[PDB]
Amino acid sequence: AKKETIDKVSDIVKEKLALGADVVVTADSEFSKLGADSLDTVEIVMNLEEEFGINVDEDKAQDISTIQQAADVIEGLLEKKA
């Protein structure tokens, strides 16, 4: 996926708890992270769809690999549809 899209996807996660200040951001860094480990797929998916302005189905945002994959999937939605 493109760096621009990857940075955006990773940015969404940080916005969850206000990050990106003194924390390093990576694409290979799975969405999951230590801390509560609560589910935020519904919130996360909407953030990406809301930000990008695409139409991602829940069936597509149910078993998405790390950010790398997320960015790649979005790239298609940005060009395709659903």
- Residues 6 or more apart from 8 whose CB is under 8 A from it? 48, 51, 52, 71
Structure tokens at 64: 């998405």
- SS3 string, 23-62, reads CCCCCCCCCCCCCCCCCCHHHHHHHHHHHHCCCCCCCCCC
Q: Quick one: which of 60, 37, 59, 56 has its CA closest to 46?
A: 56
- The structural domains of the chain, ordered by start, are 1-82 (1.10.1200.10)
Structure tokens at 26: 């990576």
Active site residues: 37
What one-letter code names the amino acid at 61? Answer: A
Distance of CA 71 to the CA centre of its chain: 7
Q: Quick one: which of 14, 32, 15 has its CA closest to 23?
A: 14
State the Cα–Cα distance between residues 40 and 53, nearest whole angstrom. Answer: 19
